[PDB]
Design a protein around this ligand. Structure first.
Ligand SMILES: *C/C=C(C)/C=C/C=C(C)/C=C/C1=C(C)CCCC1(C)C
Length: 137
């Protein structure tokens, strides 16, 4: 049992405050928080190669990477960035991002497989950490 599976969110904490740090106005933050209640993640892991598909009711993106190899994605607020994933431990990885253009808050994410079958994702902007918890569908 590795990261592979179809994961459905059961809990999201501090997501609105993450988007506030990132400059989203209140009305869209509330609509984004509602959209995150349908957040789903599909993972296929082969070694340190990861295929990820993150989706909501009306949107879906893919985001494939290999640990230790730089790649391009977008920050949570949508700005292009270059990213590098490393292991922290057997079942936790950390990704550091650097903006491709301009400046902005410092952003990163983590994924972790817990002993109790949960997937925990965090997303960070400066001081503020959002935590989302998933279970296998
Ligand atoms: C390893 C995990 C990854 C690459 C996931 C990143 C997640 C996002 C960029 C999520 C963004 C969201 C919005 C901007 C609006 C509300 C719904 C979300 C959670 C899909």
């Amino acid at each position: 049992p590795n990261f592979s599976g179809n994961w459905k969110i059961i809990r999201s904490e501090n997501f609105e405050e993450l988007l506030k740090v990132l400059g989203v106005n209140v009305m869209l933050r509330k609509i984004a928080v509602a959209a995150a209640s349908k957040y789903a993640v599909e993972i296929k892991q082969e070694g340190d190669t990861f295929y990820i598909k993150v989706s909501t009711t009306v949107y879906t993106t893919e985001d494939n990477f290999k640990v230790g190899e730089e790649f391009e994605e977008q920050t949570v607020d949508g700005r292009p960035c270059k990213s590098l994933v490393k292991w922290e431990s057997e079942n936790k990885m950390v990704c550091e991002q650097k903006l491709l253009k301009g400046e902005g808050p410092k952003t990163s994410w983590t994924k972790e497989l817990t002993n109790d079958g949960e997937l925990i994702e965090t997303m960070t902007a400066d001081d503020v950490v959002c935590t989302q918890v998933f279970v296998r569908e």
